[PDB]
Motif scaffolding. Structure first.
Motif, PDB file in Angstrom:
ATOM      1  N   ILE A 166      -6.212   5.013   8.813  1.00 39.54           N
ATOM      2  CA  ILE A 166      -4.835   4.436   8.815  1.00 39.54           C
ATOM      3  C   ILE A 166      -4.612   3.753   7.495  1.00 39.54           C
ATOM      4  CG2 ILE A 166      -3.682   2.332   9.792  1.00 39.54           C
ATOM      5  CD1 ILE A 166      -4.915   3.368  12.588  1.00 39.54           C
ATOM      6  N   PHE A 167      -5.371   3.030   6.806  1.00 45.04           N
ATOM      7  CA  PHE A 167      -5.305   2.494   5.479  1.00 45.04           C
ATOM      8  C   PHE A 167      -5.163   3.508   4.622  1.00 45.04           C
ATOM      9  CE2 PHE A 167      -7.877  -1.505   6.832  1.00 45.04           C
ATOM     10  CZ  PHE A 167      -6.661  -2.209   7.030  1.00 45.04           C
ATOM     11  N   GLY A 168      -5.558   4.711   4.688  1.00 41.94           N
ATOM     12  CA  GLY A 168      -5.564   5.857   3.882  1.00 41.94           C
ATOM     13  C   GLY A 168      -4.290   6.321   3.857  1.00 41.94           C
ATOM     14  N   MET A 169      -3.506   6.341   5.248  1.00 43.16           N
ATOM     15  CA  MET A 169      -2.274   6.909   5.501  1.00 43.16           C
ATOM     16  C   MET A 169      -1.213   5.967   4.807  1.00 43.16           C
ATOM     17  SD  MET A 169      -1.566   9.869   5.897  1.00 43.16           S
ATOM     18  CE  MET A 169       0.035  10.209   6.610  1.00 43.16           C
ATOM     19  N   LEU A 170      -1.493   4.456   4.830  1.00 42.54           N
ATOM     20  CA  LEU A 170      -0.688   3.481   4.337  1.00 42.54           C
ATOM     21  C   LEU A 170      -0.631   3.676   2.686  1.00 42.54           C
ATOM     22  CD1 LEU A 170      -1.347   0.449   6.593  1.00 42.54           C
ATOM     23  CD2 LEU A 170       0.797   1.664   6.560  1.00 42.54           C
ATOM     24  N   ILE A 171      -1.737   4.118   2.357  1.00 44.66           N
ATOM     25  CA  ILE A 171      -1.704   4.367   0.638  1.00 44.66           C
ATOM     26  C   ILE A 171      -0.930   5.649   0.543  1.00 44.66           C
ATOM     27  CG2 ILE A 171      -3.257   5.338  -0.863  1.00 44.66           C
ATOM     28  CD1 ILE A 171      -5.794   3.473   0.394  1.00 44.66           C
ATOM     29  N   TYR A 172      -1.005   6.664   1.273  1.00 45.54           N
ATOM     30  CA  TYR A 172      -0.161   7.742   1.046  1.00 45.54           C
ATOM     31  C   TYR A 172       1.263   7.382   1.103  1.00 45.54           C
ATOM     32  CZ  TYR A 172       1.596  12.774   1.520  1.00 45.54           C
ATOM     33  OH  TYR A 172       2.306  13.554   1.355  1.00 45.54           O
ATOM     34  N   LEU A 173       1.524   6.438   2.015  1.00 47.02           N
ATOM     35  CA  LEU A 173       3.058   6.229   2.211  1.00 47.02           C
ATOM     36  C   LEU A 173       3.495   5.431   0.915  1.00 47.02           C
ATOM     37  CD1 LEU A 173       3.180   7.242   5.049  1.00 47.02           C
ATOM     38  CD2 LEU A 173       3.844   5.224   5.683  1.00 47.02           C
ATOM     39  N   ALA A 174       2.512   4.515   0.562  1.00 45.20           N
ATOM     40  CA  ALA A 174       2.964   3.983  -0.482  1.00 45.20           C
ATOM     41  C   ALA A 174       2.799   4.945  -1.961  1.00 45.20           C
ATOM     42  CB  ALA A 174       1.820   2.701  -0.907  1.00 45.20           C
ATOM     43  N   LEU A 175       2.096   5.842  -1.941  1.00 48.19           N
ATOM     44  CA  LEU A 175       2.083   6.714  -2.954  1.00 48.19           C
ATOM     45  C   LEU A 175       3.407   7.630  -3.014  1.00 48.19           C
ATOM     46  CD1 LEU A 175      -1.490   8.192  -3.067  1.00 48.19           C
ATOM     47  CD2 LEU A 175      -0.364   6.718  -4.865  1.00 48.19           C
ATOM     48  N   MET A 176       3.732   7.915  -1.947  1.00 46.92           N
ATOM     49  CA  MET A 176       5.016   8.896  -1.853  1.00 46.92           C
ATOM     50  C   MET A 176       6.330   7.857  -2.262  1.00 46.92           C
ATOM     51  SD  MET A 176       5.034  11.717   1.059  1.00 46.92           S
ATOM     52  CE  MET A 176       6.050  10.915   2.083  1.00 46.92           C
ATOM     53  N   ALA A 177       6.386   6.778  -1.842  1.00 49.53           N
ATOM     54  CA  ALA A 177       7.389   5.799  -2.172  1.00 49.53           C
ATOM     55  C   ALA A 177       7.356   5.707  -3.768  1.00 49.53           C
ATOM     56  CB  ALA A 177       7.299   4.388  -1.595  1.00 49.53           C
ATOM     57  N   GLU A 178       6.140   5.476  -4.171  1.00 49.68           N
ATOM     58  CA  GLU A 178       5.942   5.012  -5.750  1.00 49.68           C
ATOM     59  C   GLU A 178       6.397   6.475  -6.662  1.00 49.68           C
ATOM     60  OE1 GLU A 178       5.356   2.743  -7.245  1.00 49.68           O
ATOM     61  OE2 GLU A 178       4.289   2.974  -9.137  1.00 49.68           O
ATOM     62  N   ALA A 179       5.885   7.448  -6.198  1.00 48.86           N
ATOM     63  CA  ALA A 179       6.030   8.790  -6.853  1.00 48.86           C
ATOM     64  C   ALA A 179       7.774   9.159  -6.738  1.00 48.86           C
ATOM     65  CB  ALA A 179       5.444   9.813  -6.080  1.00 48.86           C
ATOM     66  N   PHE A 180       8.253   8.845  -5.517  1.00 46.49           N
ATOM     67  CA  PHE A 180       9.770   9.174  -5.503  1.00 46.49           C
ATOM     68  C   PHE A 180      10.711   8.190  -6.467  1.00 46.49           C
ATOM     69  CE2 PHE A 180      13.283   6.931  -3.453  1.00 46.49           C
ATOM     70  CZ  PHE A 180      14.506   7.794  -3.659  1.00 46.49           C
ATOM     71  N   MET A 181      10.080   6.911  -6.411  1.00 48.14           N
ATOM     72  CA  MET A 181      10.734   6.016  -7.396  1.00 48.14           C
ATOM     73  C   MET A 181      10.530   6.261  -8.739  1.00 48.14           C
ATOM     74  SD  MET A 181      11.101   2.480  -5.212  1.00 48.14           S
ATOM     75  CE  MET A 181       9.348   2.315  -4.636  1.00 48.14           C
ATOM     76  N   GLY A 182       9.381   6.720  -9.242  1.00 45.57           N
ATOM     77  CA  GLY A 182       9.200   6.983 -10.562  1.00 45.57           C
ATOM     78  C   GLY A 182       9.884   7.836 -11.022  1.00 45.57           C
TER      79      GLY A 182
END
Ligand SMILES: COC1=C(OC)C(=O)C(C/C=C(\C)CC/C=C(\C)CC/C=C(\C)CC/C=C(\C)CC/C=C(\C)CC/C=C(\C)CC/C=C(/C)CC/C=C(\C)CC/C=C(\C)CCC=C(C)C)=C(C)C1=O
Ligand SMILES: COC[C@@H](CCO[C@H]1CC[C@@]2(C)C(=CC[C@H]3[C@@H]4C[C@@H]5O[C@]6(CC[C@@H](C)CO6)[C@@H](C)[C@@H]5[C@@]4(C)CC[C@@H]32)C1)CO[C@@H]1O[C@H](CO)[C@@H](O[C@H]2O[C@H](CO)[C@@H](O)[C@H](O)[C@H]2O)[C@H](O)[C@H]1O
Ligand code: HEC
Ligand code: HEC
Ligand code: HEC
Ligand code: HEC
Ligand code: HEM
Ligand code: HEM
Ligand code: HEM
Ligand code: FES
Lengths: 403, 16, 232, 181, 144, 135, 204, 16
Positions: free
Chosen positions: A120-136
C-alpha cells in the motif's frame, strides 16, 4: 574510529540503526534480477532530486519564460544539458524501474501477508510519482506539455456536478496558463518531492518491519540457526549492498548511454512535439501521453463514455491497492502457483504492454479493438484473481530457498 | 575561406 | 514520403553555408532566439568579427540571441500562421522532414502565396528559396522505373532507367540560380545548420558519453569482482 | 496566364512613363521590368478598381481587358529590372534596416518577404524591390505609413511595417534598395 | 463589443480570452438559406458541440441577426476564413456562405455548424455572451 | 480501532514508535516557559514549509519578475497576502523561537553531556536556518 | 529632516477617490503604479468600473490592467537624471508622513536643473508638478500670494487625499486584514480557553 | 458625486 563510534553510540543510535537495517539485517539469500529495482528506484529518486534542484537554479516557472529557460539550461548553462537529460531520462527510468519493481511484486506475491502495508505504501509512492511526473511534464511548456495538461485537467471536468469547478480550481485559471505552470512547478519541486520522500521512508520502514519476500515465496524466518539468523538469510550489508552496487553500475551504464547518445529515445523520453513552444490555439495533430502513462490512457480511450472512461482509468490504478486482498493463493511465488495464475500474470503483462503501445499512437480500428480487449483483460486479472487463485492447484513451497 | 562561405546574399551597388 | 539526407555535424563548411543561408533567406521571418550568435560562431569555427560582419544583420551583439524584428503575432496576421522559431525545428520535425519540406515547394495558384508543399500541404510559408531552386511544378518528368522494389539502373552508365510520370516535382529549366544538385547541397547545408542548432551539444555529448561509458565499464569490472568475491 | 509576346505590343502605351522594357528613366515612375507578374497584375487591377490611386494613370487601364492586363504583366515580368546606385552616406543604415529590421521596435526585416537580394517572391505576390527607384520606393513607404496606399489587403502588411519607419529610415532604406541586387 | 455598426453581410473580430470571436451581422437571404443546409452538417443541432443553453439550437445565436462564433476551427484550432459569398468557384456551387478552414479544408455554415465529413469534428464554439443593449453585447457573461 | 491497530502493528511500528517517542516517553515534569520553543520551532518550520510552497505557486524567481510576482501574491492572488505575511512573520518568529530555544540551552546546560550531539545538530539546524533565511 | 504628521483615513472613499484622481492626472505622467490594477483600485475605492475607465484610465488600458505608463524607466532616468520610481509601494517605502511633507516641501531653487529643491528630499530630481495648485513656494517655506489655484488648506487636503490613495495603494489589504485579524484573534482567544482548560485538567 | 470627484484635470475646448 573505535572511540569516536563509542562516543556517538552513547548519544546517537548509529550502530544500532546500522545493525538493525543494513548489517545484522538478514534478507533472503535468493534475491534475483527482480530485486535490484528498489535500490535502483532509490538511486533514480536521488538523481531526480539532485538534477531537479539544479534545474530549478535556472528554470523559470512562467508561461513566458519556461520554454526559454529550459533552452537556457540546454545551451547557456555549463553542463546544463547534461543535468536536463539526467532529469528526463531519470523520470523515464524511474517509471521503468518502478514498473519492474511492481511486476516483481506481482511475480513473487510480495504484496501478500505480511507485506500488505508495504504494497500500500508502494502504491501511494506510485500515485505520488504519477502526479510528480505529470506536473513535471508541464514545466517545459512545450506543445505536448500544455496540451497533455489541458486534457488531463479536463478529465476533472468529467465529474458530473463539481467537475468544471474542480477543474478550474486546479488550473487556477479559465485555461491552462502560466498560473497552472507556476502552481504545478511548486507542487512538483517541493510538495510532491517531500510527500514522495516520506512515503519512501514509510515504505522501507514497513518492509523492514515485516521483512523481504523472495522469488521462492519461502518464509525464511521459519527456519533459524542457533544464533537466531535464518538459514536462508544473509546480512543485507555487505552482500546485497555489493550486489546492489553492481546493479547500480549496470543501470548507470544504460542511463548514461541514453543520456549521452539517445536522450530522446526515439521521441519517447523527450517527445518531439514538446520541442515546440506551447501554443494555446494550435493543438498537435495527435496528442499522446508520455509512454509511462500510455497504458491507463488507452484504458480511458477504450471506454466510449467520458465519465466512465475517467472512472475506469482511476480504477485501473486503484485496483492495485486492493491487490493484496484479491490474491487468495496459498502460495506467494508464481513459481508454485497453479497454471491459472501464471497464465493470468502473462495476460496482465501483455495487456499492460499492449495498452501502453496503443495509447502512444493515434486511434486506429485494430488499435481500438485491442485496447478494449486489453482493458477487459487488465481488469479481469484483478477481478478474477480471488477466483482463479482458489481454483488452481499450487505446488508445495519448499522449506528452503532454491538456488 | 569562411568569409567567402559567409558572404551575405544581398549585394548593394553604391555610388563611387 | 520523406527523402533521406546524410547530415554531417562535423562538417564546419557545410554548417557555415547553412548558417549563411539561414541568416539571409530565413531570419527575415524565422527566429532562432534560443541560440546565440556567439555560440554559433564558436561551434561553427567562425571568427567573432566574421560572425558579426557576415551573419548578424539585426544590430544584435555577438552574445545576443538570434532574434528578429518580425513579431509572431504580426507574422501570424500576415501569413495566416506564425513562422515558428527554428532553433529546435530539426528536433521537432527531424532532418529528413526538413530536407523534404524545403525541396517540396511547388507552384499552386489556388493557395494564398501561389505555392503548396508535398510534405506540408497547405503550408502558410511562401516559397522563399524559389530564386535558388527555380520554378517547381507538379508536372511530368522522368522518374526511375520501380517494380515491387525492382529498381533499374543502367548497368553500363550506372544512371537510372526512367519512365515518364505526370505527378512529379519538376523544376522549370533556367528559372533558378542553382541546379537540382546545387539546390540539394544548399538545402542539405541549411538542414545541417538547423540540426546543429536543435542539438548543439551532440558532438560533445558523444565524446563525454564515450568517456563515461569507459569509466562505467571499468567500475563495473571492479564492482562485479567485489560482488562475486564476497559472495563465496 | 498572360502572353509576354502580345504584352510587349500592348505595353507600348505604358513605356511612355515606365520605359519601353519597363525600366523607367525618371525616378518618380516605378520600374515594371522584372516585377512579379502576380504583383503587377494585382496593382493594375487595383488601379483599375480604385483600390490604388495613381492619378497619372487615370483612365489608362479602363479600356484594357483582363487578358490584356495579364499579357502586359507577363511582358514586364519577362524583363530585368536595372539596378540603381545607393547613396554611400545612407547605404549603411538602409542595409541594416533591410536585412535586420528593428528588434526593439518589432519591425520585420525586408529580406523575408522580399528576398535578401530584393527580388521579391513572384508566386506570393511580394514585389521585386531591388533596383527600384529610391524616390518611388520612398514614396510607397510613406504612402503605406500614412495609409495613402491601402491595397496591401486587410492584413495591412506594409501599412503596419511602414508605420515603424521614420523619414530618415525610409530615405536610407529606399537608397539601399535602389542599389540592391 | 458594439455591434449595431456592422453593415449587412459583414463581420468584425473581437478578442475574448485570447481567442478571436467573429461577430457577424447575418442578413436575410443567409438566414433563409441556413434552414436549407441541414443535409450537409454533421452536427446540425449542435448536440455534441459547445454553446450556451439560451441560444437557438439551429441558428446557435441569441438572435438570428447577430452571429457570435469563436473563430477557432475545431480541428487543430485554426481560424476559419469568412466567406459570405453565395457560390464561390473554389467552394463549389452548393455553397451558401459560411466559414472555410484553410489549413485542412474544414467547412462550416454561417451558424458555425460544421459540414459533414470534414476534419473539424464539432461545430465552431459559441462563446457565452449576452445582449446588454440592442447595439452592444458582452462576450464572457451568460445571458440572464 | 482495536482490530485496525492490531493489523497495523503487525505490519508497522505504529504503536511501538508512539509509545517510545510520545507516549510512555517520560520527560521531566518541571519543564517551564523555556521548554515551549522546540514544539514552537517545529510549528514554525511547518508553517514556513506550507506558506513557502503556496508562495512558490505564484513566485517568479527571475530578476525581471520576482518583485512583480511578490506584489502579484500580495494583490492578485486570493488571500496571497495572508500567505506571504505568514511566511515573513514566520521567518521572524522562527528566529525568535530558535533564539529563545538556544538561550534555554544556555540557561540549563542542555548542551552538556550527554546532549552534545543534540546541541551540535541544533547548531547545524541554526546554520541551515541562517542560510535559508538569507536566501 | 523634520516631517509633518498627517492622519490618513483609509475608510474615506471620497478622499481616496480624490487622491486617485490626482495620481492619475498629475502623477501617472512620469510614475507608474504598475503593481496594482485599475479594477482593484475601482473596487476598493467604490468607483464603478465604467466610471473608472472613463475618468482614471487614460492609457487606453483595460480595467483589469496594471496602472502602467508610457514613460519607460530608462528614458525617464536619462531625461530627469533619476528614474521616477513606481509609486505603488512608496507609502510603505517612505511612509505617509514622509510623502505628505515631501509633496508640500517643494520650493524654488534656481541652482537646480528643474528650478526647484525639496526640504524633505534635497536635490531631488522631481520637477515641482503641483506648482499650479500650491502656487509659487519659496524659502521656512512660504507660498507667494495669488500664484496657485488652491490655498494652503486646500492644497494640504489635496496632498492628504493623494497620500491617502498612495497609502491605500501600498497596502490594499489593510482594511480586510484588520477585519479578518479580529475574527482570527477572537477564535484564538476562544481556542486558548479550551486549550488552557484541557491542560489544566490533565496536569492535576 | 464620484463622477465629479474623478473629473480629469485637463479640459479641452472643441469646435461646436
Ligand atoms: C492526451 O491526454 C491525456 C494524457 O495526457 C497526454 C494522459 O496522460 C492521460 C492519462 C493520465 C494519467 C494516467 C496521468 C495521471 C496524472 C495525475 C494523477 C495528476 C493529478 C495531479 C493534479 C491534477 C493535482 C490535483 C491536486 C489536488 C486535487 C489536491 C489539492 C491539494 C491542496 C490544494 C491542499 C490543500 C491545502 C491545505 C489543507 C493547507 C493545510 C492546512 C492546515 C490546517 C495547515 C496547518 C495549520 C495550522 C497548524 C494552524 C491551525 C492550528 C491548529 C490546527 C490548532 C491546534 C494547533 C496544532 C498544530 C496542534 C489521459 C487520460 C489523457 O487523455
Ligand atoms: C465497445 O466495446 C467496449 C469494450 C469494453 C469496454 C472498454 C467498453 C466500455 C466500458 C469498459 C468497462 C467500464 C468499467 O470500468 C471498470 C473500472 C471502473 C469500475 C467502477 C467498473 O469496472 C471495469 C472493470 C469496466 C471496463 C473498463 C471494462 C471494459 C469496458 C467498450
Ligand atoms: C529558410 C529559407 C527557411 C526555412 C528552412 C524555413 N522557413 Fe519558414 N514559415 C513561414 C511561415 C508563415 C510558416 C508557418 C506556415 C504554417 O504554419 O502553415 C513557416 C513554417 C516553416 C516550417 C514548418 C515548421 C513546423 O513545425 O511545421 C519550417 C520547417 C520552416 N518554415 C523553415 C514563413 C517564412 C518566411 C517569411 C517570408 C521565410 C523567409 C521563411 N519562412 C524561411 C524559412
Ligand atoms: C505616365 C502617364 C504613366 C503611364 C503612361 C503609365 N503609368 Fe504606370 N504609373 C505611373 C506612375 C507615376 C506610377 C507610380 C504611382 C505611385 O504611387 O507613385 C505608376 C505605377 C504603376 C504600377 C505599380 C508599380 C508597382 O507598384 O511596382 C503599375 C503595375 C503600372 N503603373 C502599370 C502601368 C501600365 C500597365 C501602363 C500601360 C497600360 C502604365 N502603367 C502606364 C505613371 C504612368
Ligand atoms: C515627471 C514630470 C514627474 C511627475 C509628473 C511626477 N514625478 Fe515624482 N519623481 C520624478 C522623478 C524624476 C523622481 C526621482 C527624483 C530623484 O532625485 O530620485 C521622482 C520621485 C518621486 C518620489 C520619491 C520616491 C522615493 O524616493 O522613493 C515621490 C514620493 C514622488 N516622486 C511622488 C510624486 C507624486 C505624488 C506626483 C504627483 C503629484 C509625482 N511624483 C509626479 C518625476 C515625476
Ligand atoms: C512580409 C509579407 C513583408 C515584409 C517583411 C516587408 N514587406 Fe514590402 N510588401 C509586402 C507585400 C505583401 C507588398 C505588396 C503590397 C500590395 O500588394 O499593394 C509589399 C510591397 C512593398 C513595396 C511597394 C513596391 C512597389 O510599389 O513596387 C515596397 C516599397 C516595400 N514593400 C518595401 C518594404 C520594406 C522597406 C520592407 C522592410 C522595412 C518591407 N517591404 C518588408 C510584404 C512585406
Ligand atoms: C520523482 C521525482 C521526479 C520526477 C519523476 C520528475 C519528472 C519530471 C519530468 C518528466 C519533467 C519534464 C522534463 C522534460 O520533458 O523536459 C520534469 C521537469 C522538471 N523538474 Fe521534475 N521530477 C522529479 C523531481 C523533481 C524535483 C525534486 C525537482 C526540484 C527540486 C524537479 C524540478 C524540475 C524542473 C525545474 C523541471 C523543468 C526543467 C525540465 O523540464 O527539465 N523535479 N520533471
Ligand atoms: C518509487 C520509489 C520506490 C522506492 C525507492 C522503493 C524502495 C524499495 C526498496 C529499497 C525495497 C527493498 C529492495 C527490493 O525489494 O527491491 C522495496 C521493496 C518493495 N517494494 Fe518498493 N520502492 C518504490 C516503489 C514501490 C512501488 C510503486 C511498489 C508497488 C506498488 C513497491 C512495492 C514494494 C514491495 C511489495 C516490496 C517488498 C517486496 C519483497 O520483499 O519482495 N515499491 N522497495
Ligand atoms: C526554515 C524555513 C524557511 C525560512 C526561515 C524562510 C525564510 C524566508 C524569508 C525571510 C523570505 C523573505 C520574505 C520577504 O521578505 O518577503 C522568504 C521568501 C520566500 N520563501 Fe522562504 N523560508 C523558508 C522555507 C521556504 C520553503 C520550504 C519554501 C518553498 C517550498 C519557501 C518559499 C519562499 C518564496 C517563494 C519566497 C519569495 C516570496 C516571498 O518573499 O514571500 N520558503 N523565505
Ligand atoms: S486547422 Fe482547421 S481543419 Fe485543421
Amino acid at each position: 574510529m573505535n572511540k569516536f563510534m563509542a562516543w556517538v553510540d552513547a548519544r546517537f543510535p548509529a550502530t544500532k540503526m546500522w545493525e538493525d537495517h543494513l548489517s545484522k539485517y538478514y534478507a533472503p539469500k535468493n534475491f534475483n534480477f527482480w530485486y535490484f529495482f528498489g535500490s535502483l528506484a532509490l538511486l533514480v529518486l536521488v538523481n531526480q532530486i539532485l538534477t531537479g534542484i539544479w534545474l530549478t537554479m535556472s528554470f523559470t516557472p512562467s508561461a513566458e519564460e519556461a520554454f526559454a529557460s529550459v533552452e537556457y539550461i540546454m545551451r547557456d548553462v555549463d553542463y546544463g544539458w547534461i543535468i536536463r537529460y539526467m532529469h528526463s531520462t531519470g523520470a523515464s527510468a524511474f517509471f521503468i524501474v518502478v514498473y519492474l519493481h511492481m511486476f516483481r511484486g506481482l511475480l513473487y506475491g510480495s504484496y501478500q501477508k505480511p507485506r500488505e502495508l508495504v504494497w500500500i505504501f508502494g502504491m501511494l509512492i506510485y500515485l505520488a510519482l504519477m502526479a510528480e511526473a505529470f506536473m513535471g511534464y508541464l514545466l517545459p511548456w512545450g506543445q505536448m506539455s500544455y496540451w497533455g495538461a489541458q486534457v488531463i485537467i479536463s478529465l476533472f471536468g468529467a465529474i458530473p456536478v463539481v467537475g468544471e469547478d474542480l477543474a478550474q480550481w486546479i488550473r487556477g485559471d479559465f485555461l491552462i496558463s502560466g498560473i497552472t505552470l507556476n502552481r504545478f512547478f511548486a507542487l512538483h519541486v517541493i510538495a510532491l518531492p517531500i510527500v514522495l520522500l516520506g512515503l519512501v521512508v514509510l515504505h522501507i520502514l514497513a518492509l523492514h518491519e515485516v521483512g523481504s519476500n523472495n522469488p521462492d515465496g519461502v518464509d525464511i524466518k521459519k527456519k533459524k540457526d542457533e544464533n537466531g539468523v535464518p538459514l536462508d538469510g544473509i546480512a543485507f550489508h555487505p552482500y546485497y549492498t555489493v550486489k546492489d552496487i553492481v546493479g547500480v553500475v549496470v543501470f548507470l551504464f544504460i542511463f548514461c548511454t541514453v543520456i549521452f547518445f539517445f536522450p530522446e529515445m526515439g521521441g519517447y523520453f523527450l517527445e518531439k512535439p514538446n520541442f515546440e513552444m506551447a501554443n494555446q490555439f494550435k493543438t498537435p495533430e495527435h496528442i499522446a501521453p508520455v509512454w509511462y502513462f500510455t497504458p491507463f490512457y488507452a484504458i480511458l480511450r477504450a471506454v466510449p463514455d467520458k465519465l466512465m472512461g475517467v472512472v475506469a482509468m482511476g480504477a485501473a490504478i486503484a485496483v492495485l491497492f486492493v491487490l493484496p486482498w484479491l490474491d487468495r493463493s496459498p502460495v506467494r511465488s508464481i513459481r508454485y502457483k497453479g497454471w491459472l495464475s501464471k497464465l493470468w500474470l502473462v495476460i496482465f503483462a501483455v495487456s499492460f504492454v499492449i495498452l501502453g503501445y496503443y495509447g502512444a499512437q493515434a486511434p486506429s480500428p485494430l488499435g481500438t479493438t485491442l485496447s478494449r480487449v486489453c482493458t477487459v483483460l487488465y481488469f479481469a486479472f484483478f477481478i478474477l484473481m480471488p477466483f482463479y487463485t482458489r481454483m488452481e492447484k499450487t505446488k508445495p513451497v519448499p522449506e528452503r530457498v532454491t538456488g | 575561406a569562411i568569409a567567402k562561405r559567409l558572404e551575405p546574399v544581398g549585394k548593394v551597388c553604391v555610388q563611387g | 514520403q520523406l527523402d533521406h539526407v546524410d547530415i554531417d555535424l562535423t562538417d564546419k563548411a557545410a554548417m557555415q553555408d547553412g548558417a549563411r543561408t539561414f541568416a539571409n533567406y530565413c531570419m527575415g521571418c524565422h527566429s532562432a532566439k534560443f541560440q546565440r550568435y556567439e555560440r554559433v560562431a564558436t561551434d561553427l569555427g567562425i571568427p567573432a568579427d566574421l560572425m558579426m560582419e557576415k551573419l548578424v544583420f539585426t544590430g544584435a551583439k555577438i552574445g545576443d540571441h538570434m532574434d528578429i524584428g518580425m513579431k509572431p503575432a504580426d507574422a501570424k496576421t500576415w501569413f495566416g500562421a506564425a513562422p515558428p522559431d527554428l532553433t529546435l525545428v530539426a528536433r521537432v520535425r527531424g532532418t529528413d522532414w526538413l530536407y523534404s519540406y524545403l525541396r517540396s515547394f511547388y507552384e499552386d495558384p489556388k493557395r494564398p502565396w501561389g505555392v503548396n508543399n508535398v510534405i506540408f500541404p497547405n503550408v502558410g510559408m511562401p516559397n522563399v528559396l524559389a530564386p535558388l531552386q527555380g520554378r517547381q511544378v507538379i508536372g511530368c518528368k522522368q522518374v526511375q522505373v520501380v517494380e515491387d522494389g525492382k529498381k533499374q539502373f543502367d548497368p553500363l552508365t550506372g544512371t537510372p532507367l526512367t519512365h515518364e510520370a505526370c505527378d512529379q516535382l519538376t523544376v522549370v529549366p533556367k528559372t533558378g540560380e542553382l541546379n537540382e544538385a546545387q539546390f540539394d547541397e544548399k538545402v542539405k547545408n541549411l538542414v545541417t545548420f538547423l540540426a546543429y542548432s536543435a542539438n548543439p551539444n551532440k558532438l560533445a555529448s558523444e565524446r563525454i558519453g564515450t568517456y563515461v561509458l569507459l569509466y562505467l565499464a571499468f567500475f563495473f569490472v571492479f564492482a562485479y569482482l567485489l560482488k562475486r568475491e564476497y559472495w563465496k | 496566364a498572360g502572353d509576354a509576346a502580345a504584352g510587349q505590343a500592348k505595353a507600348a502605351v505604358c513605356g511612355a512613363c515606365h520605359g519601353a522594357d519597363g525600366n523607367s528613366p525618371a525616378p518618380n515612375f516605378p520600374k515594371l521590368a522584372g516585377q512579379g507578374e502576380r504583383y503587377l497584375l494585382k496593382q493594375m487591377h487595383d488601379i483599375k478598381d480604385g483600390k490604388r490611386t495613381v492619378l497619372e494613370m487615370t483612365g489608362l487601364l479602363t479600356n484594357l481587358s483582363d487578358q490584356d492586363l495579364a499579357d502586359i504583366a507577363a511582358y514586364f515580368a519577362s524583363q530585368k529590372m536595372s539596378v540603381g546606385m545607393a547613396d554611400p552616406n545612407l547605404v549603411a543604415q538602409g542595409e541594416a534596416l533591410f536585412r535586420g529590421g528593428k528588434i526593439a521596435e518589432g519591425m520585420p526585416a525586408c529580406t523575408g518577404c522580399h528576398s535578401p537580394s530584393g527580388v521579391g517572391i513572384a508566386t506570393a505576390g511580394f514585389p521585386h524591390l531591388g533596383g527600384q527607384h529610391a524616390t518611388y520606393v520612398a514614396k510607397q513607404l510613406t504612402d503605406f505609413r500614412e495609409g495613402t496606399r491601402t491595397n496591401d489587403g486587410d492584413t495591412k502588411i506594409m501599412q503596419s511595417i511602414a508605420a515603424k519607419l521614420s523619414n530618415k529610415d525610409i530615405a536610407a532604406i529606399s537608397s539601399y534598395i535602389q542599389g540592391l541586387h | 463589443v458594439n455591434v449595431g455598426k456592422i453593415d449587412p453581410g459583414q463581420q468584425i473580430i473581437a478578442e475574448w480570452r485570447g481567442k478571436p470571436v467573429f461577430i457577424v451581422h447575418r442578413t436575410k437571404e443567409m438566414l433563409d438559406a441556413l434552414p436549407s443546409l441541414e443535409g450537409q452538417l454533421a452536427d446540425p443541432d449542435s448536440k455534441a458541440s459547445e454553446q450556451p443553453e439560451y441560444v437557438d439550437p439551429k441558428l446557435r445565436s441569441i438572435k438570428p441577426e447577430l452571429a457570435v462564433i469563436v473563430g477557432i476551427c475545431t480541428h487543430l484550432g485554426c481560424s476559419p476564413t469568412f466567406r459570405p459569398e453565395v457560390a464561390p468557384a473554389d467552394l463549389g456551387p452548393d455553397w451558401k456562405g459560411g466559414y472555410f478552414c484553410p489549413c485542412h479544408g474544414s467547412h462550416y455554415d454561417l451558424a458555425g455548424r460544421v459540414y459533414k465529413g470534414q476534419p473539424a469534428p464539432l461545430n465552431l464554439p459559441i462563446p457565452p455572451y449576452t445582449f446588454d443593449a440592442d447595439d452592444v453585447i458582452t462576450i464572457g457573461v451568460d445571458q440572464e
